[PDB]
Amino acid sequence: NRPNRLIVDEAINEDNSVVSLSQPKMDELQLFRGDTVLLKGKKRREAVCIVLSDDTCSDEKIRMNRVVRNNLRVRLGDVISIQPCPDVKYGKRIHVLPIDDTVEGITGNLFEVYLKPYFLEAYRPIRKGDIFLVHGGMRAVEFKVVETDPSPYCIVAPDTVIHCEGEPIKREDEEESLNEVGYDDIGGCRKQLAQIKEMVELPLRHPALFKAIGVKPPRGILLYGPPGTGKTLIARAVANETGAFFFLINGPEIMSKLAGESESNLRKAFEEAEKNAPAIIFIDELDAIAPKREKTHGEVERRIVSQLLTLMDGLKQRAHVIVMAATNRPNSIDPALRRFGRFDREVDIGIPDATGRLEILQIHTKNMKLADDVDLEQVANETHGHVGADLAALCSEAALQAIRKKMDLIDAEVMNSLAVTMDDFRWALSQSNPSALRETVVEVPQVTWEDIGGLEDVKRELQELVQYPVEHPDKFLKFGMTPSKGVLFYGPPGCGKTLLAKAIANECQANFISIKGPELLTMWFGANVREIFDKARQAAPCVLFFDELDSIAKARGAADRVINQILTEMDGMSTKKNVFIIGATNRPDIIDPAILRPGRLDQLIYIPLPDEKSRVAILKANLRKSPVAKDVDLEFLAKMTNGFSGADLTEICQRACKLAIRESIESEIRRERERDPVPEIRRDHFEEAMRFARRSVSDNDIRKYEMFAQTLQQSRGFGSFR
Amino acid sequence: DELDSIAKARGGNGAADRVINQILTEMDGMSTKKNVFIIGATNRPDIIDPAILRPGRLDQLIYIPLPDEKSRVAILKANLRKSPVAKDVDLEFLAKMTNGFSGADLTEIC
Numbered sequence: 001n002r003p004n005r006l007i008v009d010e011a012i013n014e015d016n017s018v019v020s021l022s023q024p025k026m027d028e029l030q031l032f033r034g035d036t037v038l039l040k041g042k043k044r045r046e047a048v049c050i051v052l053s054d055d056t057c058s059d060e061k062i063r064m065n066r067v068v069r070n071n072l073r074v075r076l077g078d079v080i081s082i083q084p085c086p087d088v089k090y091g092k093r094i095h096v097l098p099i100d101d102t103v104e105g106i107t108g109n110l111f112e113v114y115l116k117p118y119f120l121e122a123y124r125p126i127r128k129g130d131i132f133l134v135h136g137g138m139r140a141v142e143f144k145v146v147e148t149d150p151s152p153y154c155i156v157a158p159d160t161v162i163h164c165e166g167e168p169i170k171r172e173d174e175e176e177s178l179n180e181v182g183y184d185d186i187g188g189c190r191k192q193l194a195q196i197k198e199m200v201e202l203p204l205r206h207p208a209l210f211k212a213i214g215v216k217p218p219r220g221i222l223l224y225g226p227p228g229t230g231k232t233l234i235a236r237a238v239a240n241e242t243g244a245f246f247f248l249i250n251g252p253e254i255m256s257k258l259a260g261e262s263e264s265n266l267r268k269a270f271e272e273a274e275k276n277a278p279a280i281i282f283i284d285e286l287d288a289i290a291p292k293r294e295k296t297h298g299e300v301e302r303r304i305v306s307q308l309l310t311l312m313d314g315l316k317q318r319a320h321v322i323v324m325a326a327t328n329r330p331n332s333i334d335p336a337l338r339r340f341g342r343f344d345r346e347v348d349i350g351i352p353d354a355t356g357r358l359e360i361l362q363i364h365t366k367n368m369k370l371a372d373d374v375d376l377e378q379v380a381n382e383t384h385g386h387v388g389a390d391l392a393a394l395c396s397e398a399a400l401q402a403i404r405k406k407m408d409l410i411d412a413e414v415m416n417s418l419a420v421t422m423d424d425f426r427w428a429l430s431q432s433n434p435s436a437l438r439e440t441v442v443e444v445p446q447v448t449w450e451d452i453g454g455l456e457d458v459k460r461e462l463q464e465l466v467q468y469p470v471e472h473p474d475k476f477l478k479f480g481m482t483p484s485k486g487v488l489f490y491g492p493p494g495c496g497k498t499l500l501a502k503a504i505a506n507e508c509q510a511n512f513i514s515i516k517g518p519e520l521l522t523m524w525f526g527a528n529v530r531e532i533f534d535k536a537r538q539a540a541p542c543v544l545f546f547d548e549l550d551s552i553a554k555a556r557g558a559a560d561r562v563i564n565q566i567l568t569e570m571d572g573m574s575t576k577k578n579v580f581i582i583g584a585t586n587r588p589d590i591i592d593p594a595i596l597r598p599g600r601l602d603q604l605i606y607i608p609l610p611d612e613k614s615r616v617a618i619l620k621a622n623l624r625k626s627p628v629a630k631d632v633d634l635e636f637l638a639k640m641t642n643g644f645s646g647a648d649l650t651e652i653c654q655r656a657c658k659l660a661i662r663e664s665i666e667s668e669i670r671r672e673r674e675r676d677p678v679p680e681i682r683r684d685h686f687e688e689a690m691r692f693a694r695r696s697v698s699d700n701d702i703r704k705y706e707m708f709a710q711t712l713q714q715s716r717g718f719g720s721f722r
Numbered sequence: 723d724e725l726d727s728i729a730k731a732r733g734g735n736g737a738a739d740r741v742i743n744q745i746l747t748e749m750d751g752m753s754t755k756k757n758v759f760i761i762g763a764t765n766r767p768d769i770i771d772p773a774i775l776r777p778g779r780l781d782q783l784i785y786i787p788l789p790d791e792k793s794r795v796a797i798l799k800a801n802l803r804k805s806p807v808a809k810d811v812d813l814e815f816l817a818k819m820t821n822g823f824s825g826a827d828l829t830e831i832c
């Protein structure tokens with residue numbers, strides 16, 4: 001429960017001793033007022049304080065002062081616990097740091113009046129890693145403790161002999177690096193960070209969790225995914241939250257040595273990591289360090305990977321050391337590294353979602369003052385396929401666009417009055433280069449099932465065949481049969497077959513890996529299917545989308561070799577792990593008859609012509625600023641039954657709204673000529689779009705797809721298709 | 723299995739019809755002894771690449787007829803699969819109307 005962990009109030013006083021939570025909170029835990037408890041904080045920071053808790057204050061609010069929240073590295077409204085340490089004493093040597101931002105203006109001796117009358121005969125708790133601003137000599141003076149020998153939960157008294165240090169030096173880079181990472185500084189990847197915490201739960205605070213499991217789950221964790229997604233930031237978060245001795249080495253840094261000196265400091269890093277009983281050692285750029293053994297063209301690379309492969313399993317059960325590696329690409333690594341003995345936890349970071357990008361912008365706009373005008377949500381849902389460094393660059397470019405429209409002077413004229421607008425963010429978003437685009441994305445989309453008309457019985461049966469094994473495991477572990485994995489879609493070439501799988505992924509609430517047609521051919525010529533199915537099994541549960549299987553069958557062997565490898569990896573899928581596969585096709589004459597056989601993609605679903613109310617949900621999305629189509633004859637266009645060839649009634653809707661845009665721009669033209677544009681559309685442009693209406697598919701092809709109703713007759717010759 | 727896929731991949735004169743020849747080269751690598759036994763399953767005899775059917779190499783050919791109607795008895799008694807048997811029904815009614823009477827997928831009816 002941790003009942004002492006409650007929120008932080010503002011300053012009622014100044015010094016670290018004079019903080020108050022509640023005298024009942026000194027009464028249930030029975031901690032005395034005089035004892036130096038340890039108020040917890042981020043980056044393992046606990047501070048020594050003779051806490052004067054008062055019952056007249058709010059019992060959930062510690063009265064932490066203005067310079068105390070920087071010392072515990074916590075904010076207002078953060079949970080703080082307490083740890084007693086009665087082992088305090090004073091030594092002759094001490095080290096304090098004045099800072100020229102505060103103390104400069106008054107001089108004298110270094111234990112003079114500027115700290116006397118509040119630490120007269122003090123024996124008050126100072127702490128190494130604590131900086132408190134105390135006003136003295138009509139001037140505010142900060143006091144950072146940098147060195148203390150005798151049990152650093154320590155005591156100093158300026159009426160005794162002080163080892164006073166008088167160098168005023170700025171540490172503003174250290175001030176910005178005082179926190180420098182945190183769990184609050186990581187957003188959008190909470191499941192991955194929770195998994196990382198579950199993996200590193202054993203070296204910190206529970207080393208004796210080996211009678212539960214003797215595996216001590218394996219030394220070696222891989223972080224892979226896109227580049228620039230803050231894998232080093234994740235490593236620093238583990239580094240400063242675990243509190244273990246962190247011994248990271250950069251890969252190019254240990255590659256930059258001469259011949260024979262690559263083992264130098266590489267063996268020494270492991271020999272340094274062997275000493276401390278909590279110890280994590282980290283390596284970056286594994287692809288530069290250890291490539292595939294075919295690409296190891298030089299002898300020094302083979303020497304380096306042999307030295308690493310010796311040093312990994314040659315050291316074992318000593319101070320429970322854990323290695324961790326960050327890479328940008330998983331299959332370029334040497335396959336001898338990733339196995340069951342070493343380097344097994346291939347967790348992936350991945351690009352963030354819209355909620356993830358929103359959280360990244362929320363934690364990036366914390367240390368920046370916006371103009372309080374944007375929503376910070378428009379940029380979130382109109383950025384797609386963005387890495388976190390791209391979002392940092394987008395915020396930087398928006399701030400630079402805000403800067404660029406100001407007069408150049410050195411005073412604080414835009415320092416205090418900084419203002420970033422939505423138009424600056426649109427300008428930064430326009431001049432952006434997101435290199436996470438075209439990557440095989442994983443997401444749960446927002447295609448909102450009511451938008452998809454479809455057919456009711458088809459939607460109901462796909463709801464059965466997808467969700468009802470999944471969301472009812474009691475009707476899937478005790479009653480049922482073998483699940484029919486896979487479903488194929490065919491019909492008219494555009495009639496509502498793409499978004500049905502999207503809606504399935506929406507109201508099944510699963511991941512949706514989609515590839516559309518020639519992406520397989522492009523990624524094969526430019527293996528890849530193995531990585532696709534590895535990502536599909538790693539992001540389980542998921543629904544695969546084989547959109548336009550008809551398009552790759554017109555490549556005809558002339559690169560038909562990939563579809564049998566598709567069916568090779570699809571037949572290498574077990575019935576469990578909750579993966580799902582969907583095939584989509586238009587012209588079923590080249591259907592490649594190994595598809596439809598049982599054990600494979602087998603569920604035939606025929607998509608017919610849509611219903612009369614398919615036009616209604618088109619007006620839900622809206623993007624050209626005038627009020628929507630309303631109070632017109634929606635169903636009477638369906639009564640005329642024109643345009644009644646599958647989908648693509650959105651062509652009629654877009655044509656009518658483009659006529660509306662032409663009407664609006666002509667109203668703007670006459671308004672600009674002469675010096676309420678009738679925003680809502682009337683029926684006339686709908687009538688004119690009805691005049692410029694074409695059928696998308698022929699009635700002969702309707703007869704052809706009617707003849708393809710019993711298209712399950714396979715493994716027979718074509719017979720010329722009379 | 724899926725020898726008809728290898729048979730159907732002969733178009734594109736990426737042919738890979740010589741992989742069948744590699745298989746038959748490894749087939750006479752097998753002696754008549756060592757007690758290994760090779761089984762070929764196919765669905766289409768016209769494109770069978772008839773160098774395979776040279777005698778002494780897959781010499782016996784078995785034509786599988788239309789299947790027996792009594793698959794529905796043993797498709798559920800011998801495979802429960804977390805659901806009990808179809809109690810108190812007429813199983814002869816299915817073969818009386820001869821539903822799905824060309825090949826399998828009586829298990830798909832189940």
Ligand SMILES: Nc1ncnc2c1ncn2[C@@H]1O[C@H](COP(=O)(O)OP(=O)(O)OP(O)(O)=S)[C@@H](O)[C@H]1O
Pocket residue numbers: 185186187189227228229230231232233326328360363387388389390392
């Ligand atoms: N999960 C995240 N939370 C917060 N900021 C992030 C996150 N991911 C990326 N960023 C930002 O993106 C920047 C990318 O910096 P790096 O940590 O160097 O990325 P990286 O993934 O380590 O790149 P490499 O491949 O290791 S050189 C960070 O400095 C952050 O500003």
Ligand SMILES: Nc1ncnc2c1ncn2[C@@H]1O[C@H](COP(=O)(O)OP(=O)(O)OP(O)(O)=S)[C@@H](O)[C@H]1O
Pocket residue numbers: 451452453454455493494495496497498499516547548610611613614615617618646647648649650
């Ligand atoms: N019954 C329907 N009700 C509403 N909108 C529909 C309906 N059928 C199709 N649409 C819309 O028609 C448009 C095209 O449908 P799609 O299935 O995406 O065509 P598609 O040709 O299969 O797309 P591909 O395969 O990616 S080229 C989408 O905007 C759908 O929302």
